[PDB]
RNA sequence: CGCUGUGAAGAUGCAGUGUAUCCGCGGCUAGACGGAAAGACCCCGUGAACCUUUACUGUAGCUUUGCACUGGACUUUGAG
């Protein structure tokens, strides 16, 4: 399935290179969140008309993604729920309800790649190593 | 009608012979191979059914792997 890149993914990301990927790589991943696009004969043609315009763009969501890193990396942001010990609480100490608390000081800071299996990651060269300190 | 023979081989009907007027009724069951059911036993039909199994050939189901749905990455794995 010879598809061009949107964004630039973290293996075979040149941003419009024709990268040859197995059919469920697109059609579950690619296309409906949004990193490619199949090349249809025209959309490469239409990609030229448009690169001029987005990858400056993307430089520049990507620019602002290491301003808001590096903004906020030095938050020592604490809970006030109530907690049964450092690290076993009585709720749920994860990246479920972290959002206001680093919404009520700076940045909203949407939660969807805040790694912890606190490393936040943000873009695919942009990451931060925050950390976070729970009183209980 | 009986008997003795004969006879598809156990006779009311054939032969010979004996007995015996015609016709009921109440009884009895020895025979009419008495009535009833195209013997069920037995054998046969290149008949049926249902049952069994390590009969044959199949098959539901269960299971094995290939391919599809089906992807990313990192690592132990041959030749270019
Ligand atoms: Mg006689
Ligand atoms: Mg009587
Ligand atoms: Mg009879
Ligand atoms: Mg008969």
Redesign the pocket.
């Known amino acids: 399935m010879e598809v061009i890149l949107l964004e630039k993914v973290?293996?075979?990301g040149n941003l419009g290179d024709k990268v040859n990927?197995?059919?469920?790589?697109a059609?579950?991943?690619l296309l409906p969140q949004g990193k490619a696009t199949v090349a249809t004969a025209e959309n490469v043609a239409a990609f030229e008309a448009r690169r001029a315009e987005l990858e400056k763009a993307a430089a520049e969501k990507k620019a602002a993604a290491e301003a808001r890193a590096a903004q906020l990396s030095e938050l020592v942001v604490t809970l006030g729920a109530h907690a049964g010990d450092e690290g076993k609480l009585f709720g749920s100490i994860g990246t479920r309800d972290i959002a206001e608390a680093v919404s009520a000081a700076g940045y909203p800071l949407e939660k969807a790649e805040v790694r912890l299996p606190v490393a936040v990651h943000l873009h695919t060269d942009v990451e931060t190593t925050l950390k976070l300190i729970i009183v209980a």
């Open positions: 973290a293996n075979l990927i197995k059919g469920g790589y059609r579950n991943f």
